[PDB]
Amino acid sequence: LSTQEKSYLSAVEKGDYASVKLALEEAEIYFKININCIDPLGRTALLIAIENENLEIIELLLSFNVYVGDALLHAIRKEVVGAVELLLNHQFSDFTPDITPIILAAHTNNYEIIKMLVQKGVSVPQPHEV
């Protein structure tokens, strides 16, 4: 984890919009740092910007086509409505390979997200009774 990545992650964590944009611009032309990097606990830039609900940072990081991965599940578990709206209209995992967006949304009684998901059309598989 280079220092040029520690500076970038710190800028994302505080909320310095101009600095994060400058780092992203200097990355696409010099290819120095890897935007898909992990900090010691394992977070990426997307997770850091979602954990603080920084909608401007989240929108910016989508305009540079970062890796999304299980970023929708994290927003659903954190119950961030704006982040879910953004992520919808666009290897180590923390979730079991059987958890889908609608299931994980239904575990949390959040009416807004559940309605937002079922408006797009989903389906939960009924298990055969015994």
């Binding site: 964590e13 505080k14 909320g15 310095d16 919009y17 101009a18 954990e51 603080n52 609900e53 920084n54």
Partner: peptide
């Protein structure tokens, strides 16, 4: 998490204003 949210709001506000006056 609420405390970190409320601290980050102030941080981003400060950065934006400082950059706006310079």
């Amino acid at each position: 998490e609420n405390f970190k949210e409320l601290k980050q709001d102030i941080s981003s506000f400060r950065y934006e204003v400082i950059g706006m006056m310079k």
